[PDB]
Amino acid sequence: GPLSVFGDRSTGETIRSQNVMAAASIANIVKSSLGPVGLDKMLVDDIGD
Amino acid sequence: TLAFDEYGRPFLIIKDQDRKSRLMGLEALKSHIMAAKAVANTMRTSLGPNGLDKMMVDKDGDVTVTNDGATILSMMDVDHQIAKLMVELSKSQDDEIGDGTTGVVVLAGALLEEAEQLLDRGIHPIRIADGYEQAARVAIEHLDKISDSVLVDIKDTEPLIQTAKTTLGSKVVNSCHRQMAEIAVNAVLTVADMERRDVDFELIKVEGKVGGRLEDTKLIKGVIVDKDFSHPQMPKKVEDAKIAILTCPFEPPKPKTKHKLDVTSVEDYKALQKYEKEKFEEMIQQIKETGANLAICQWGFDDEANHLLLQNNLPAVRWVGGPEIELIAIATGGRIVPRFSELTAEKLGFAGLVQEISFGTTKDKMLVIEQCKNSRAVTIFIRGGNKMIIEEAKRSLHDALCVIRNLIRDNRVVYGGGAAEISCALAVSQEADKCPTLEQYAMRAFADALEVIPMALSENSGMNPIQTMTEVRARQVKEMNPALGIDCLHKGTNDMKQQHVIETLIGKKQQISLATQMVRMILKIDDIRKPGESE
């Protein structure tokens, strides 16, 4: 009947809404570090750096 | 993303959303058709007189071989909500008419298979559903063209027998195809109220006992109960029975409240012995003063009352059921008496040969009522070689009792064997061009799905579907359309009027009406919100 792939398939407006939230997840991070009133961040690693 | 927001917060809408299943897509309609076609392909092989039966096993290990479409889909463990609606579709045909429970599932799966190719062309699913309503309306009006019956329930039982042979021809009762067909005709006409056109199936008792053969099934005018003569020396044959039906146990009268009767002296204890000794002589004499020679009691008997039955020559049965004695008072014309003091000669029942019959080596000894006087209650005694052939004959003959009931509700008939489906398919194709504005493709998908039922009869009979259907459909256009179908041994010609394949009008009228509305509820759905695992 359906596709017999062993992975995962998502069609329609599901991925069309997921790619915007994937791009907005990156833009909402770097929005606080733009312009002369922007502020720096902290990038802490698992090893402690 | 799912279960997380773009700001890092957890995104939870409903509870346990990770173990949910939701499909809107374009395959949500495709999953409903592939689940419904597999039910229709299962029921396709059990259609017609050459339809092969199915073996159903219950959860307890009991095996029942069924052929009717109502009991097949009901005894499944299908956990699919689209196929569960096909179970209630075959149940709705059994509750209303009760003859086309197999054909209403193949027709519903045929409308969804033709709608699959219409869905890929870009047609809206409600536009197909609105096109099926305008196409099924033509099939209802065309089915009422040729319809006539001459049943008078006096001597013209010949249209009634041939109507029941169409229903019993597909079951396993074809060895008794003439004997058992006449049983279901006379069982309805003796209990039906022709002034109201109402038939009550509570008056038709269907009992079964293993032993004998299928040819030993007789229509017993009366009642058949388990006889429980408390005395083993009771006479087992009454020639003329004045039946005294009572609902009081043969005992001293016990009240319904708490009494705690007090005994003080020895004169009160000797009064206890004379009270019960005169009570058992009063309950026996009040039956003999009415002239009765047979008693029926719902409750038990006392040991002191058992020997008083033999001294007065009064046979009596013990521990009869609730609705069983309700059938005795109608078959014998008597009245059910609450007490013993209200017994009279007018409340007695009349019966002829009252006897018990032992079946082989068992100890059942069922009641056989041969003679009666204007009874309104009959009992069919189904015998067979095993319990598989009896429980199926209880389901096969019940479909034969329903098609006679539908003739009293509506005295119009059609001709089966695929003759009515080909004639209705030509009516939709003629009105598809008047006018082919929007719903031209939806009406032609209805006419191509109406031809699945006669081409399934050609497949089960060993013929070719597209070769036999093209010959029958072309002969109805070149001349005026007769009752032209098919058969298994084909009986020579293909004329259904000569082969006496007669079906009810309202049977096929509800086959097209219920399958169209069930298709509309499974086409007008674009989401599934089923859960995941059980726990």
Next chain:
Amino acid sequence: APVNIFKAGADEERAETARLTSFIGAIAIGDLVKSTLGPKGMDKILLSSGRDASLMVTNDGATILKNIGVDNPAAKVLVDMSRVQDDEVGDGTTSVTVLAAELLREAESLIAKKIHPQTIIAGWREATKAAREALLSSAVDHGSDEVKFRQDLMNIAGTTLSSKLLTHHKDHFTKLAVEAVLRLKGSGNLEAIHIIKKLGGSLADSYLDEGFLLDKKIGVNQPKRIENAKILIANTGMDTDKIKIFGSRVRVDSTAKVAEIEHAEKEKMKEKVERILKHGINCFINRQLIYNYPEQLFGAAGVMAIEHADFAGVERLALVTGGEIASTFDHPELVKLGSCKLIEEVMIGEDKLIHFSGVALGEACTIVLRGATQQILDEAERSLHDALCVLAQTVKDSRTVYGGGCSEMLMAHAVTQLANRTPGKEAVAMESYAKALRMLPTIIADNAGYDSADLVAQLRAAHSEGNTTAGLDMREGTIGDMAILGITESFQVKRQVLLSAAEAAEVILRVDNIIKAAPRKRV
């Protein structure tokens, strides 16, 4: 339905494994009890895994199939088929199981021949109709001339007991089975012949009692034997009556009135026994229990008292003595008493039983089965039950047919004669019906060790030109006349073997889909 399966734990199959599991499960049932068919077939011993296994050896095909518990769905139809055969005629439960399995084995041969299964059903319905006329036209009736009917009844019991454990006891057990039904002189109730199984002694030491045997010996201080007595039985309560008034207490003011009530209770129990001895009796049988207060009253009057025989024990005493139950004692002129000669107690297997020797109107018997083990007594009881049930229906239907393979070749000849007057669509299914009827003398011939390929070929050549009474002789291993050797069976037994196997094979052959549901508590 296998593709995109919409079931939870249930599985199904359509036209591929449906008829495959139906033909495997039904042949393996028929091949199981194949070795128990015939006068030289062996027996089975049935055992469980434990927890009071209760081993029960049986040769009858109904008792084997009712205890195995087959998991196959189509095999339960043949199990239920042999259950009705034991309940209706009591014989041929093994013969109806092999015949219904040989029909489906010939139907499995029609799988590769591409025959439609509805054509085999229509071909077997015409074959069964031709086989009914072969048994009906060859049935031998017996009306008057009763010295030939009693000789015919010994051929029925001699044929049934030859296929059981009672092989070399046909000189005794045939007389124990014919005279038991002959003493009924009426309807075949099949409960007046009370079979008592006692250990010790051989099967030749078993006998049919001329009177009646019972348990629950005569009182404490009562006489053990009374000559020329009048037997009165009862079904009434003796002591601790609590007579039919629920919600009645003894509410007194002093304890001296309680002594007057309990003396008045014992006076009414004494007056009830005084109403019993006004009939002029010497023996008393009560279905209920007799306590100590009426037991002293019967012992002082010299009257026996048999307490709590059985619920069906007073029914057999009413048929062997000629009395009535008489649960109420208020009219001595309307109560008929029994008759006997000796009520002495006999000892059978170190157990004292009450022997009702010399009874009048004795329409009841008592078979005293004595065997080496309990396994022999459980087999000889079912072997005698398979012989008394046929003789109880042979006196109701006196039509008899010639058994020992002679009836099966008469049925197979009528099908083959009408198979040549049919077109080739249904003629192949009728030839498979006649080949399965010839398998029933083939199983009997091969169980003894004879040449089954030649003896059935000699039976088919004999029945093709005359010889309506020619059958299989299992004594010497040849073909002989069945009217001379005296190997006959009942007509209703041989009809139910043919008719129930044709109906049961019709159900399984019409199955194209086996949809089994998900079972409970099976993981």
Next chain:
Amino acid sequence: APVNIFKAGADEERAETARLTSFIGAIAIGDLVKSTLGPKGMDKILLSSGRDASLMVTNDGATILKNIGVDNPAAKVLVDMSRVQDDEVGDGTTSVTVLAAELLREAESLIAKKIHPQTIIAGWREATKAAREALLSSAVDHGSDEVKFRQDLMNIAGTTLSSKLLTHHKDHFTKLAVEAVLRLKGSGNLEAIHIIKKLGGSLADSYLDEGFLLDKKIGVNQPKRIENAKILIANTGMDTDKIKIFGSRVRVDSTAKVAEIEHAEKEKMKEKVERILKHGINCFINRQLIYNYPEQLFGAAGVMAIEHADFAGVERLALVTGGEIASTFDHPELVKLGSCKLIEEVMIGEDKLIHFSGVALGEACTIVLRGATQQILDEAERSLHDALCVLAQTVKDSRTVYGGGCSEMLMAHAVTQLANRTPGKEAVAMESYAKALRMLPTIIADNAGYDSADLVAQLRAAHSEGNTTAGLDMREGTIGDMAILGITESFQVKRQVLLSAAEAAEVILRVDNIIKAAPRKRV
């Protein structure tokens, strides 16, 4: 041996489940490939559970059984039987599997008849001896009059390719198979016909090349086409020789002597190429790899250089050009060169191959199979391999028999004529041998959808009185003459179907005990 078992993890069975598992496991092999027999039978698609499953559709019965991996012990005898049939004659691997299974299916019918299994073996040895005389007396030889032998060879390839995927390609693929063996003009080595499978195009676009195709294209700066050239091949090392003295070093005192040694190494490698071009050649094929230093020498002289074709690629070039391998270059008067006309490069499926057009003494071919998918190319290669192997043996043994069911009815008639001249002990086994030979036209007739119950019955009535060339016509669905329609098979192919199935059924029927040992790493 089951009772008081003296084994650790091994089990066995004797005479009850030994022949039961042998008859179930062998019929299920024969009923599997039953649907692939005949010119209207379907094909199978073989798949694994994963881990490079490599799906390979095959209709030939040898390739199906060699990849399924049956766990049954007796089924591996029929699996190995079809492997030998593919290795000897290359055809009839499906026909020998169903025939060996139909012998054991008739032997399962002799279980209930109580026939001794050694009587069935001795009955089949006389039946197989009579069946050899039916094929030997009906074989049609072809000596002179070669215009009727080439028409007879197209009937062999037309019958073999009719039961494969090449159904509607008999107007093309018959000429590709007959002319491929006809261009050998000698022994059937079955390796000069190199089949090249390329994607793109239909099966009608496939063709037989008039020359020869190769890979590993001509150098870097070498000419791509030379007209009227002399082809010289080789099997020698070009560069980095390390010539045959293990334990030889260059032990010098300064690095200036290493420059003189490596210049002396390149002078001897240049002198080796100068000995090659003294023959007067234009093309060079080396089985080993050609490095950069001799590649510049062949490019400067205008000589081609084909490096590392194949180990068996220089054998096909030696048979298509008429030369020799010539691994040593020291006698130009004793080295025979090849001959060609065009060595142009052709492009088949976006791949440049070297076309040896116009070669002399071309006893080698190249079939360029073009298909829609790789599944069709893997099936058409095995379909052509099953067609070229029969024509390679038909030119060695010109005896041909009439196929299409005509040969099996001739073999079954000779057994039935001698089944009536035998005593009844072995005559029943010979009748089962003749019924199994008639199943082979029954499987072909039922695969198309025809009435197999009537067509084989008409073939038995035709062969009973004359009609030695009457067979089954699968075109219209009737009975026709096989000499007119031209449906013939080879004698050695039909003999190996009869002989290997009778020997393999002799082994499995003689097994009464299957003692399987304890397997390793299975728990």
Next chain:
Amino acid sequence: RGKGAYQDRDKPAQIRFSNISAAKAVADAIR
């Protein structure tokens, strides 16, 4: 008359619909 009857009680009538329904899912995936 019916001029014959060809009973086909075998497996691959259902597997033929499995190859059709699987190829329809591929054509609808890249539609």
